Design a protein around this nucleic acid. Structure first.
Length: 1122
RNA sequence: GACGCAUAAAGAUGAGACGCGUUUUAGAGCUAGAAAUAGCAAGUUAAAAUAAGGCUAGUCCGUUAUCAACUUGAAAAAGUGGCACCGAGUCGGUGCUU
DNA sequence: CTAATCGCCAGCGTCTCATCTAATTGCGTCAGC
DNA sequence: GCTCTGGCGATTAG
């Protein structure tokens, strides 16, 4: 007996079929186990498996990072307390305790209920003097009197905890930048640097610069309007750098210095001055103007007598808010009394009371209040403010996302420099506080673990706790920046032990250029066939036409080389379009940088180069590059080092160094490069050298050279296709096992992926898994593995009237797999099947094995939102001591699996034990506690005298079978899902597909009237379809109300055309599809869903255990338990 | 079938940081009143938590992938279910055979 | 003191750095013959 | 040669 397997792979399904030799599906008699009353089930060999798609590991990553940002921040404050503790032991020895316990309710506090002062009068006075924290910060910055230590700590902690962003490097001075009339100093500097009496346009001032946007479309208009220049730099060649930075890196005018090379504000300025000193300013005022623009974009109050602009801006905002509020209140009271209580007392709307106490944002408040004041009188200023987002604003909003940290730090400095006079400790350890504020872990060091994390790579120099003060004396920076890169680069395919070489490297470029050049097929009149060049000619031509220029075309090789002879016009070439795809770029760059010849041509020096290009590829910071290059300082001049350290390379190659240079034969003593250079009159390239038996370069690879999951998990692609592939691999294995341990003859695969290599990998995996019997001479193909496109099956489907609709049932996966197998087997035989009646019989079969994979749930504990306190038993505590009846908490957890527990429980007024049997919900949070010791766990839950052996665990999608062939799957401890299929006969499906798509052609225009005539003489199929649906829904669905609503809805619309009627009959199958109930739409009526919330009807049913294929089964009669 | 150079649109993993949002508490409400109530005044901020927690005690870990039942085995992992013919409402009927 | 109904709710925006994959073009190779 | 779908708080009725 010989058979064949057909498969169809997807993201949420897989379909399998087995055909013997005539496109016929066999049938067999399998046996069942358990305490039931069955012994044999007759099953057909075709079906599908259904699961739910996997998901990427990105979201989890984000959560992890967020965690790491709350562990460090809480430390950032604790350090500060360590510096204040002793001093704070003298003023109030309970300040920190109250700050810690402020969250608890009034009764759980073991101290006073006022955090700061411990009094009522002092607290009220403090809140009255400083309405906000910004008043306190500005007062501490600007005043000169002795303050209280508590206020200093509060201000410092508020600045340390919220510390701005780190996107700008350098120094920023708000005092010298808030004055935006500096442009006159720019004009006078421009006049003094270039004496030609420049002209300018009067009318453009600081405010016009303020309104300018980052988009160059408005920037060009601003620059042409502000000054009509006299030269290229005047128009836009220089002012762009002054306004924002020299973003272009190409010469706009020769007069800048020589060319244009400056960039924006980063760590490059300290070297970019080398561009200007050679051509000695506007470059100093450019920074001031750019800083002025970028700082006045966010700050309104310019500095006159204050060193704190941010606090002044916030105070001004607060005062304007108060004034606008009182004016609006008075006017609204005077002109529209009826709306008053609607806007200032109701929290359920978007009024002012819903803006402060409710949950509305600025946009909703403005959109709700604009029409209210639109029809009023005396609302011009408020209306114009509402269009600029300045009406009744708050201090802490989203717009604060663009505050640099260099602002915050500035204020901190001031707050110390005064109060250090009265407190010696502040002067003693000011630098500690600054370092606490402005310390960040570099992105190339990562976590600071001690070998217990699978994410870290850091290497230490000693053994001691790591703090911001002794960071650079415990951790190692070069050894960490090296491992940050060495843990991601590829290995050499030929030898899986060596690291690859950087893409730009002298050895690698030599290999590439010689490999390309050695196969030149030059032809001449005298020599009719393409010969191969000799070693000395290559050695001459490489330096003649490669070490002097980087780019060479065909003309250069045809003319320049043959100048010594007369055959320059008689040599023709082939295999090159117009140039060579190789160059000695690194050689030319090092020649320009070093300006020396012998150091590059000498072989003995190449080792040094092998490091000079290595570091320039690994590191990215200037400091570490300089530290590594310090070793070779004496080799070149200081100017040479300064110009060299500005060169950066990226990328990596694919061939290591041990293979290109370092391995040689024992009978020749030459390396691959040597042979490729001087093979002789007949030359061979890398591919011919490596795959050669005359020299011992083959066996070296063989002597230089595993579970399934760890090999699957290394493919490239989305995890969904990986899940599908892993399922298919096991489906094939079980199918092989079932039918007598005889391997198939063909396997036909078809992929279907959406957002020609994954198919080649799956085919490789299956072929390597199947072909094991290895011959001894050379290689045997016991089985084949065919690959098929998706067009052929679709054409065979749409040509012979084998239509399909996906809304009826889940039977189309198996039919697709069967058709794939049939078409492939037929097609690989001739180098359109026969007896189509067999195909129709197979596709009209009522028995197909559809199984849904059972799974235990994983994920988050419960819903992420925190709910207000209320008296209920569904609230989950947030910490252990926070009782949800006083602080709120989470609700609606997620269950992992359920358990069938049978035992006694006290009940009734008599307080007596009664036998009971119920399900239970073991949440994700409680899984470990149950699995560690179940008996105690569910004895503390209420039950007692529990039988140990009768406990059964039921994952999601467990299958129960009830009376009259009614199947329900399980979804939770208190909900069920439908589990049956509808097997509609083929003729109804064929008619129903043709009725739809009525207005659009399906084939030739001359062969379409027959389909119409068919639909008019078979119009009366709709009643039969409705009767079929009604009978099925009466037998297995039990949805009488929805069914008799659907019946009336259909009966009311019998006069509509056929197209709409059929297109809406298609919509009615949502009532009978398995899975979760869903709401569908008829013509105009809407039908709501019916959900099964009672799970007590499956405790007397039969529990079915199923295999992945679905043919092996186990049945348990639950009526005998108890 | 696989390997080394010449290409412009998407993804897939890991690291370092900002700005909001939500819960509880603090910021003394007044007057007419027997009562349920009514009239007025105020509103912009701060503290703590941000998966319950763990031991290996780190300025570290805790939402990805894997998962029918029974027998052996801590785990790794290994094993367990007859064949032909006629038919078709979720699979039946007949004949050999352990 | 439980079973059939109808209805409402679910955390979200942004910035820097590094390493891998891959479909088609033309280049010359092996695998084989 | 060449190859979306479970939880939760209300309603009236057996």
């Amino acid at each position: 007996k010989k058979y064949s397997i057909g498969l169809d792979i997807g993201t949420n399904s897989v379909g399998w079929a087995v055909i013997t030799d005539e496109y016929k599906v066999p049938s067999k008699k399998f046996k069942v186990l358990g305490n039931t009353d069955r012994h044999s089930i007759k099953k057909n060999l075709i079906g599908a498996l259904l699961f739910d798609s996997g998901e990427t590991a990105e979201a989890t990553r984000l959560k992890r990072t967020a965690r790491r940002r709350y562990t460090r921040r809480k430390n950032r404050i604790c350090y500060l307390q360590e510096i204040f503790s002793n001093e704070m032991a003298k003023v109030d020895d309970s300040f920190f305790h109250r700050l810690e316990e402020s969250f608890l309710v009034e009764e759980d506090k073991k101290h006073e209920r006022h955090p700061i002062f411990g009094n009522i009068v002092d607290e009220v006075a403090y809140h009255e003097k400083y309405p906000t924290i910004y008043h306190l910060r500005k007062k501490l910055v600007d005043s000169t009197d002795k303050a209280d230590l508590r206020l200093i700590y509060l201000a410092l902690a508020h600045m340390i905890k919220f510390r701005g962003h780190f996107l700008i490097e350098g120094d920023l001075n708000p005092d010298n930048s808030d004055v935006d009339k500096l442009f006159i100093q720019l004009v006078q500097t421009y006049n003094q640097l270039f004496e030609e009496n420049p002209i300018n346009a009067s009318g453009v001032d600081a405010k016009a610069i303020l309104s300018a946007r980052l988009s160059k479309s408005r920037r060009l208009e601003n620059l042409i309007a502000q000054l009509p220049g006299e030269k290229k730099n005047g128009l836009f060649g220089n002012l762009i750098a002054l306004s924002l930075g020299l973003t272009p890196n190409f010469k706009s005018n020769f007069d800048l210095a020589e060319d244009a090379k400056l960039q924006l504000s980063k760590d490059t300025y300290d070297d970019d001055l080398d561009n200007l000193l050679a051509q000695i300013d506007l470059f100093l005022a450019a920074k001031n103007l750019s800083d002025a623009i970028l700082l006045s974009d966010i700050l309104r109050v310019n500095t006159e007598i204050t060193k704190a602009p941010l606090s002044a801006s916030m105070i001004k905002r607060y005062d304007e808010h108060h004034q606008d509020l009182t004016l609006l209140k008075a006017l609204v009271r005077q002109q529209l009394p009826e709306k008053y209580k609607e806007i200032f007392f109701d929290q359920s709307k978007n009024g002012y009371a819903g803006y402060i106490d409710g949950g509305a944002s600025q946009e909703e408040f403005y959109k709700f209040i604009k029409p209210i004041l639109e029809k009023m009188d005396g609302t011009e200023e408020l209306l114009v403010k509402l269009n600029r987002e300045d009406l009744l604003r708050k201090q802490r909003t989203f717009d604060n996302g663009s505050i640099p940290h260099q602002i915050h730090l500035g204020e901190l400095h001031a707050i110390l420099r005064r109060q250090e006079d009265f407190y010696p400790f502040l002067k003693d350890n000011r630098e500690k506080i600054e370092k606490i504020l402005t310390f960040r872990i570099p992105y190339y060091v990562g976590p600071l673990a001690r070998g217990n994390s699978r994410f870290a790579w850091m290497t230490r120099k000693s053994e001691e706790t790591i703090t911001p003060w002794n960071f650079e004396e415990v951790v190692d920076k070069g050894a960490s920046a090296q491992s940050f890169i060495e843990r991601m680069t590829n290995f050499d395919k030929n030898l899986p032990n060596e690291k690859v070489l950087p893409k730009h490297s002298l050895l690698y470029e030599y290999f590439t250029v010689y490999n390309e050049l050695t196969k030149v097929k030059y032809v001449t009149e005298g020599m009719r066939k393409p010969a191969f060049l000799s070693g000395e000619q290559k050695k001459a031509i490489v330096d003649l036409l490669f070490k002097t220029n980087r780019k060479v075309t065909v003309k250069q090789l045809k003319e320049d080389y043959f100048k010594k002879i007369e055959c320059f016009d008689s040599v023709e070439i082939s295999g090159v379009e117009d140039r060579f795809n190789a160059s000695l770029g690194t050689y030319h760059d090092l020649l320009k940088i070093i300006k020396d010849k012998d150091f590059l041509d000498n072989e003995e020096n190449e080792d040094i180069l092998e490091d000079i290009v290595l570091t320039l590829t690994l590191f990215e910071d200037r400091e570490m590059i300089e530290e590594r290059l310090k070793t070779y300082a004496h080799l070149f001049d200081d100017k040479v080092m300064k110009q060299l350290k500005r060169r950066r390379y990226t990328g990596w190659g694919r061939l290591s160094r041990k293979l290109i240079n370092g391995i040689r034969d024992k009978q020749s003593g030459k390396t691959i490069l040597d042979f490729l250079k001087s093979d002789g009159f007949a030359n061979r390239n890398f591919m011919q050298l490596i795959h050669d038996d005359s020299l011992t370069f083959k066996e070296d690879i063989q002597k230089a050279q595993d579970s399934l999951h760890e090999h699957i998990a290394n493919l490239a692609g989305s995890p969904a296709i990986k899940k599908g592939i892993l399922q298919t691999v096991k489906v094939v294995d079980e199918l092989v096992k079932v039918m007598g341990r005889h391997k198939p003859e063909n396997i036909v695969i078809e992929m279907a992926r959406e957002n020609r290599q994954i198919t080649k990998h799956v085919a490789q995996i299956l072929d390597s898994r199947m072909n094991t019997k290895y011959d001894e001479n050379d290689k045997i193909r016991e089985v084949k593995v065919i690959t098929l496109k998706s067009k052929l099956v679709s054409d065979f489907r749409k040509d012979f009237q084998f239509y399909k609709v996906r809304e009826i049932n889940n039977y189309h996966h198996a039919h697709d797999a069967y058709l794939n197998a049939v078409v492939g087997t037929a097609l690989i035989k001739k180098y359109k099947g026969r007896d189509f009646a067999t195909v129709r019989k197979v596709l009209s079969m009522p028995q197909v094995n559809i199984v849904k994979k059972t799974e235990v749930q994983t994920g988050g504990f419960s819903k992420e939102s925190i709910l207000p306190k209320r008296n209920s038993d569904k609230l989950i505590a947030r910490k252990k001591d926070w009782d949800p009846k006083k602080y709120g908490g989470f609700d609606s957890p997620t269950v992992a699996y359920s358990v069938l527990v049978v035992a006694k429980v006290e009940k009734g007024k008599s307080k007596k034990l009664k036998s009971v049997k119920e399900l239970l919900g073991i949440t994700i949070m409680e899984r470990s506690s149950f699995e560690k010791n179940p008996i105690d766990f569910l004895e503390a839950k209420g039950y007692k005298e529990v039988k140990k052996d009768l406990i059964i665990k039921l994952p999601k999608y467990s299958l129960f079978e009830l009376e009259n062939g009614r199947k329900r799957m399980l979804a939770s401890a208190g909900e069920l899902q439908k589990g049956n299929e509808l097997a509609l006969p083929s003729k109804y499906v064929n008619f129903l597909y043709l009725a739809s798509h009525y207005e659009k052609l399906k084939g030739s225009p001359e062969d379409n009237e027959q389909k119409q005539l068919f639909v008019e003489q078979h119009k009366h199929y709709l009643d039969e379809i409705i009767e079929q649906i009604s009978e099925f829904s009466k037998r297995v669905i039990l949805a009488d109300a929805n069914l008799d609503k659907v019946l009336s809805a259909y009966n009311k619309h019998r006069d509509k055309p056929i197209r709409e009627q059929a297109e809406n009959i298609i919509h009615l199958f949502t009532l009978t599809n398995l899975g979760a109930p869903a709401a569908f739409k008829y013509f105009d009526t809407t039908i709501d869903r019916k959900r099964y919330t009672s799970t007590k009807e499956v405790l007397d049913a039969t529990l079915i255990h199923q295999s992945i294929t679905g043919l092996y089964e186990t049945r348990i009669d639950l009526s005998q338990l108890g």
